[PDB]
Amino acid sequence: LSAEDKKFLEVERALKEAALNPLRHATEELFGDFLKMENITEICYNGNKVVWVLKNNGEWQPFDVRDRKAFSLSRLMHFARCCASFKKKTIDNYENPILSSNLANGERVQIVLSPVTVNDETISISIRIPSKTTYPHSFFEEQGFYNLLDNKEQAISAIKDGIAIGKNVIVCGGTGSGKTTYIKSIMEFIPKEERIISIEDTEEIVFKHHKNYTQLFFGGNITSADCLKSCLRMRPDRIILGELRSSEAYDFYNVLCSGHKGTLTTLHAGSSEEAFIRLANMSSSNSAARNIKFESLIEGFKDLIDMIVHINHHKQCDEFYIK
Amino acid sequence: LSAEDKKFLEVERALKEAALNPLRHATEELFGDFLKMENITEICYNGNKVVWVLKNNGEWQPFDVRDRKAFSLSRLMHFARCCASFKKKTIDNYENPILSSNLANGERVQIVLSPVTVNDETISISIRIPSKTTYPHSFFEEQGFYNLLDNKEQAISAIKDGIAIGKNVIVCGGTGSGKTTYIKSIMEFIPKEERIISIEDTEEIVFKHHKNYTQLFFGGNITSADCLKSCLRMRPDRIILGELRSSEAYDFYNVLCSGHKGTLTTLHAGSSEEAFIRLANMSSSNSAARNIKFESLIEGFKDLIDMIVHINHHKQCDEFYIK
Amino acid sequence: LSAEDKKFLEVERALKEAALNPLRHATEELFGDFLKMENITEICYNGNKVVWVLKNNGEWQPFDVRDRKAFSLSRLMHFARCCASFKKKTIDNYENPILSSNLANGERVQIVLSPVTVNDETISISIRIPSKTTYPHSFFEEQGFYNLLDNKEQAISAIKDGIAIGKNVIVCGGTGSGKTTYIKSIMEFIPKEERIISIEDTEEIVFKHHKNYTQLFFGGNITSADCLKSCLRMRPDRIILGELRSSEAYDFYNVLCSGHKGTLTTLHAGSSEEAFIRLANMSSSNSAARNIKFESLIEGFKDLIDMIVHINHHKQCDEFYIK
Amino acid sequence: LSAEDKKFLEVERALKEAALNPLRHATEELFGDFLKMENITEICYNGNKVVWVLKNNGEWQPFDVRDRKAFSLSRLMHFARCCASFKKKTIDNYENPILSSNLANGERVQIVLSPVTVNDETISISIRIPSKTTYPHSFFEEQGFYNLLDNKEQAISAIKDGIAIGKNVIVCGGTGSGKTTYIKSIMEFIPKEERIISIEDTEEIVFKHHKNYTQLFFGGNITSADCLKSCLRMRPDRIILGELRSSEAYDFYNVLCSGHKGTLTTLHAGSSEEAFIRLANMSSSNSAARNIKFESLIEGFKDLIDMIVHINHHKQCDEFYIK
Amino acid sequence: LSAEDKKFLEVERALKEAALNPLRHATEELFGDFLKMENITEICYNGNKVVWVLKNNGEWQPFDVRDRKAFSLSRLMHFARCCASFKKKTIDNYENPILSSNLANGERVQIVLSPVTVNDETISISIRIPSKTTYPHSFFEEQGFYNLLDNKEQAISAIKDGIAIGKNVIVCGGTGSGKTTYIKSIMEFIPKEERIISIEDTEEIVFKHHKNYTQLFFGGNITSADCLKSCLRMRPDRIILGELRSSEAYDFYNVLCSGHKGTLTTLHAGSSEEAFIRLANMSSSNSAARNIKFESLIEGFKDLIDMIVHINHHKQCDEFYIK
Amino acid sequence: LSAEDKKFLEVERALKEAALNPLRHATEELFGDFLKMENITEICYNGNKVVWVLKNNGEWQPFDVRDRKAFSLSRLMHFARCCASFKKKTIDNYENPILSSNLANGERVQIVLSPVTVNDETISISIRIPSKTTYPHSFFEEQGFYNLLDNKEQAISAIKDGIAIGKNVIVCGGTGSGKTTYIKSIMEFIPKEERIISIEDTEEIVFKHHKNYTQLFFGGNITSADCLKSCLRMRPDRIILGELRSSEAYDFYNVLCSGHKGTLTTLHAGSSEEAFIRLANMSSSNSAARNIKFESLIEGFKDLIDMIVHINHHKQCDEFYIK
């Protein structure tokens, strides 16, 4: 089969690998060193000859590249273009000065050029390093994840038992707060017989205890809602929504209204009460919600969401909303 | 007549059977074995050389196909395309990566390709086996369908008598909860003289006790609402709506408002109170509902729906809402 | 004049009669026998070689046509097409599988073909036999039409006197409940000097006691609202709206708001309270109602509608709402 | 000047009078006799060889024309077309079966043809005779116009004094109730120095006591609102709105909100409370009202309208709302 | 500079002065005499050979022009056309029968032709004479402008002091009530150092005590809102809005919400409470107000507007709302 | 790298500097002298040969240019066009009479021409001088910035501590009130380790204590929201929004709802309570807010905004809203 599968992939691979190699060398050439760094969460470039790296410990570390070819207005632009074309987009100094794309391996990239940056020699790049490690839940308890909670044992058991029964759980907090990481470890408590479907933007979730599953990715023409909609047609036992965005927003409510099993998703929210408002908002953006009272959605999400876990900027649970 | 009916069908049959045969062999070739399995509810493929089958008893069973030609990226793609073309759709790795269609006999098929699947060697297929059996109502009582209810006799008699008088009844619950099945058996209690019209997506309902009837199917160009709208022009005594979707949603409310006889339909809802909300939601999606207060619909459905029956994941009634 | 009127009609008649004859023979050929049957209300065909006829007494009678040429897939399709073209529409197995048209004499026809019907040999036809008889009001009293009412004399006199004074009256109930028939007999109590205008879909109303009048028909490009709008420009004393549909819905409210005389109309509603909701709904569908509070319409119709009469499935008044 | 005015009008006159003459002879030819009848309010034809005329005393009088050439399907059609073309419209038996236009002198005409009329030999015409006489107010008092009122003197003086001060007054009631007439007589009490602007559909208002004035007519391209909008740019002391229609509806509210002087208009409403609702409705039809609470308009009109006078079907004031 | 400025203006001037001269002679030719008349406010023509002039004292004076060439259907039309073309518009007897334009000097003109006027010999013209005089505030006190007020000294001082501090003041009343005139005199109390920007339709405001200022005019493609929007970009100390219209309506609210200094504007409103409603209305017409509660605007304007002055038809303050 | 960076910029620089030089000389030629003046805030020209300059101390100073070539209708127009073309816009006396652009260095320019200005010799220019200086916070305390406050120490410490913790703070007041300035000094209290992203319209913010940062500019094709949206993808610790405009308005609410760190922005509002209303308004302009109750936004912003500081026209804090 592989002999035929290869000849069958040949055409697409050639095409893809004819746009992914130029980008691979450029990436390698510029941010290669930094990408090798362990425990980092972001790599930024403020077109000022210095590369700023954000570490898991929340510390920004600057690096000097004054004397490097890979950081020439031209060498930079070539990498920029490599990013646009990869995701089939264009990047220039007129109509498309701002850009959003990805690297060869999947990391999100944010590129900005003049006239949007302060001058014509400033090229702003911002790469987001996904969750590339899986620590067991126990690891989280050890590091004292539920230490700020007064319902410490109640929480540690709620999460374990709850998820095992298929409650709808939301993990929220700020950027890089460790939400994705957290949901990844608590997956240990989902019966290994459950068919799981995940909707991601970047492959981040890993299935260490589940043979039957399937991953879905949105981006470009295909939308987050498209994945979730397809998801509900693929007979899932558990649906792991990388992170509620805005498209899924409303369709997520309906999925909850049909009394759907184990839902687990991360979201940008500063707390439980906030998450609830956060959801109503995003839902109301969808036309289908047009005729539904706003304060009617919040109550709606408040009946459906079983438990919420919020994580502060110090990667620690500081709120464990239940029921 | 058959001699002319044949020559008259000849042209359409040729055309149809020139797109249905390629699909039949592919189907047969790949999921032939699995489709033959008794008491299954879904057949999934996660493009990882293993076929997962979900049994009626809720158990997932993996089957190895590492050494089968029918599971070659090419052999799989040919079957995929056969599905697209059958329902007159296209499936590719650019604009049409996700697909929804059917098999030669009517079973729903969900196909997903790269870039939506994790890689270019993953082809996700999800086949849903319809309700292909009819157990008498008595069979449900024997298996203790109304055993979790405290109003056990009241329930078993309500359903029987109610339906016989033409009350509006909704059967709700999760996917594969046995709703389609349940309504099919309780049809025994509808006077055999009643002209029945059903709106389905896949032939599933069977008329074992009714000579005068007619089945309607939506899909593609023709919408669920279209069928129901035509239905109301075909002089029905009972209308069996396969399952409230969203188009019919509002038009179903109006049909209830005109005080229509015996309505029976399945719906995705986790309970009685949920079904009510579920309906208001779907109704409000229809423009015609634009000027109608949301909390006005729920009350609306709550006056019209005579009785609701919810089935848990263990195929058992756990709620018997009435009046 | 007739000599010239004939030469003047010649062109249109030729055209019309060149599409109405093909349809006449086909009709005659297939459902000719059944159409001759007295006291029937519907003739259905479930493309299964059996013709089902619904009688006034609410009984379904099957007839075998296994051995009849008029019921050959081809012979059927020819009649089908004859129906489309007549009303200037198309009927096929692709974009136009469902059809709604009429017969040579005016009866509504509902035709459905594959892929909407279960298979390619099933052709569903449903003809609605209009009200083709006029029983005097006295006949209704004799058959005990107001017998279920406790305000028996009050009702029999209300209807008589009310209509004589030009109150707005609505006759509602299910399909074939005898509404049109009822309004037709109670017309006896409208001063013979009143100019009456009727808006129908199929000629059904007959003027036995009124010389000055005019009938209006909607269908195709011309809408129900168009007739009513023209109606209000033809100086009517009484307006008989065959049956409130949805277009007239709102324009009917305004007509009531201008304090218009004797309005009489039939409607699909299961009761008085229902009719009121039924109206608000239909009105809110019209854009012009966009800025009007829904609960504001119901109250609106409740101030305007003088009396409502509902008829159960046994062709008997079971509710006589007044004031 | 007349010598040049003639040569200057020559071109337009020729054109107009080349479409108005054909119509004049047809008119003359058919309804010539009837149009000559004194005290009539409508002339209808139900394409059944009989001409029905409605007299001021509310009596319908039938006239036989069985033996007249002017009533030949052709002779009738020629007159019909003459009406269409006059107002630059088309009338046929397909897309333009219904028609609304006018006669050589301005009377509204409603023409209906098959398929909208019952058959192809029925041509329905409905002519409305405008208010072609002016009876002094005193004449109304003599005929006992304010006789049903208990506030008889208060009413007769309110109208006189009120109007003299420029209050906003509405005259409402049914069709032909004598509203147009009533307002025309009460104009006697408007200081002769007032510049008056009227917005009509058909010249009906006459200025017997006012030298400074100007009449405006809407129809076709030009809308009722257009006239009123131009009106407010022509420095009016009094604005006589023939009859609130729907366009002016909202723009009338704003005109009242700017505290405008003497407004006088007729409206189709069955009473004071009704007129108020009637107004809110029509206002809410205008987009500009989109963001304005419905129950906010009624209160709005209720602050602005100074006094309303309703006339029953017997041409008598039966309600004299004030303040 | 003038030598070059002339050669620089040459092109535009030629063009403008090649359309303004034809209009100058026509104007001069027809309404030349009347325009010379002192203390007039409007000049109307009802195409009946008589010219009606409205004097400041509120008296209408007719003038006979039966024997004047300037009033020939042709001589009139030439002037009419001169008006259209000037403001780059068209005026005819078909699609553009109504017209709005201006004269060589800026006065608003309203022209109406058949079929909108009663006949083909009636040409209605209405010229509005702007405020062409500036009376000192003292002049207003002398003529007893604040004489009907009980808070006579409080009012005379409020206006003086208030405006000096930059409160938001609205002057409202009917047409020609003397609002523009009033605001023009009270400008005396604005510190001469304030940079003032005015948004007018016709130059009317005069700056007698302010060197630093700038006038803005809307008309044609440029809208009232455009001026105000530009205004807020020209660093104004005081903004004099000729008169709130409808475009500025909402943008005026926001300007008040940002806590902007000295706003002074005239408006058509019959009183303080009315002005407040008047504003909410106009604001709600703007899309940007779409999601803002109507009763939320009124309160909004009621917090922002510092003081309102209303003037009756006798050019006298009759309401001095404050705080 | 510089050798290649130059050859790489060469093409864009040539182009830009081929449109920026003409503008530089014109600028220099006309407002060169004024631009050199210290402590000014605006430079206006009212096309009347006098240049008005507004000084920091709020004083308007007139300068005579009667005898200068740079102020010739032509010389002025050339500079005007230079402005249009620079920002790729057009400026003429027909469709583009009003203009908004910038100067060679970034200062906003407002140009107005006839017919919008009073005549064809009036060319109105309004130049706004950005914040080109940075006074330490201490400097503000010395000049008694918090002197009008009663919570003087509480305020001076709130700002210092609050900002250090990353509270959301809004600085509001009138134009040129010193907001841009104020926020710039209080930046001293943001841990130097924070990555800061600013969204400006004109480079004004200066980073004196922050190495890791990036500036964003909107204008033309690129919108304020675009920058903020990109901002949220560039991993910011603090987001300095030049000044809430209207696009960001709603997207700012959501950013607050996700519980985002340190937000600091200036806004046009006359006070705390006003700012709150100001925000709800701007938010409701965005479609995404369509389904969100207005009074729901104000409460929303009132939960999220930590502290507001308002500055009167005398550049002094007069309100210090907290919590």
Ligand SMILES: Nc1ncnc2c1ncn2[C@@H]1O[C@H](COP(=O)(O)OP(=O)(O)OP(O)(O)=S)[C@@H](O)[C@H]1O
């Ligand atoms: N308990 C932990 N101990 C150490 N590092 C951790 C911990 N939890 C998460 N991380 C680190 O945090 C990063 C992953 O953060 P995520 O969980 O993806 O952040 P995030 O908050 O989900 O960001 P977005 O905006 O949602 S994509 C990786 O670098 C991890 O190694």
Ligand SMILES: Nc1ncnc2c1ncn2[C@@H]1O[C@H](COP(=O)(O)OP(=O)(O)OP(O)(O)=S)[C@@H](O)[C@H]1O
């Ligand atoms: N009192 C009666 N006795 C006997 N037959 C009746 C009576 N009233 C009505 N019918 C029969 O009922 C049929 C007419 O029913 P309709 O009055 O048109 O029904 P309908 O309810 O108005 O249907 P739609 O859906 O409104 S078109 C005819 O066959 C009649 O002969």
Ligand SMILES: Nc1ncnc2c1ncn2[C@@H]1O[C@H](COP(=O)(O)OP(=O)(O)OP(O)(O)=S)[C@@H](O)[C@H]1O
């Ligand atoms: N106190 C006054 N005494 C004498 N004439 C006055 C006085 N105030 C105003 N006028 C006259 O009124 C006219 C100006 O009226 P405006 O103040 O422009 O009217 P207006 O009400 O503002 O009209 P619009 O509809 O707003 S354009 C001029 O003819 C003035 O001479």
Ligand SMILES: [Mg+2]
């Ligand atoms: Mg994450």
Ligand SMILES: [Mg+2]
């Ligand atoms: Mg009927």
Ligand SMILES: [Mg+2]
């Ligand atoms: Mg004015």
